């Protein structure tokens, strides 16, 4: 192996502000890391079920910034156009603010 952590995990991280029901919590999220994975590693308890982009459990809404959720399946094109994000399969592509716990907002 290597005598250092992976550069991709130490450097170049995006700021992700999770606007949760219990307040805003800003974490660093590597570009190669799904938002849910960074949040759960940081000790947050965000909702999820399938971890595969096929449900609404981990849904959030992008309040600021952009994501890459090319692996997602469940959201329709309009929902994604309107800012919904499946946090379990979404990489940040900018500093961003994601309101969590938005499953119920989906129609
Ligand atoms: S937990 Fe099912 S889509 Fe994210
Ligand atoms: Cl949950
Ligand atoms: Na990587």
UniProtKB/Swiss-Prot annotation:
Q: Where in the cell is it found?
A: Plastid, Chloroplast
The cofactor binding remark recorded in the entry reads: Binds 1 [2Fe-2S] cluster.
Q: Which cofactor does it need?
A: [2Fe-2S] cluster
Q: Which domain of life does this protein belong to?
A: Eukaryota
Plastid among keywords: yes
Q: Output one GO BP term.
A: electron transport chain
Q: Which UniProt keywords apply?
A: 2Fe-2S, Chloroplast, Electron transport, Iron, Iron-sulfur, Metal-binding, Plastid, Transit peptide, Transport
Q: Name one GO cellular component term.
A: chloroplast
GO MF annotation: an example: electron transfer activity
Q: Which positions carry the signal peptide feature in this UniProt record?
A: none
Q: Where does [2Fe-2S] cluster bind?
A: 50, 55, 58, 88
- Identify the residues that the record assigns to the 2Fe-2S ferredoxin-type domain, covering every copy: 14-104
Biological role = Ferredoxins are iron-sulfur proteins that transfer electrons in a wide variety of metabolic reactions.
Q: How does it associate, per the subunit comment?
A: Forms a complex with heterodimeric ferredoxin-thioredoxin reductase (FTR) and thioredoxin.
Q: Give the record's family classification.
A: Belongs to the 2Fe2S plant-type ferredoxin family.
| Protein known as | Ferredoxin, chloroplastic
Per the UniProt record, the source organism is Chlamydomonas reinhardtii
Gene encoding the protein = PETF
């Amino acid at each position: 192996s290597w005598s250092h952590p992976q550069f991709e995990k130490i450097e170049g991280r995006y700021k992700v502000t999770l606007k949760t029901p219990s307040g805003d919590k800003t974490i660093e999220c590597p570009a190669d890391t799904y938002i849910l994975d960074a949040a759960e590693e940081a000790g947050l308890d965000l909702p999820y079920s399938c971890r595969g982009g096929v449900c609404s459990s981990c849904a959030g809404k992008v309040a600021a910034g952009t994501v890459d959720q090319s692996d997602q399946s469940f959201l329709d094109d309009a929902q994604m156009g309107n800012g919904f994000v499946l946090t379990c399969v979404a990489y940040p592509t900018s500093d961003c603010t994601i309101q969590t716990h938005q499953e119920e907002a989906l129609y």
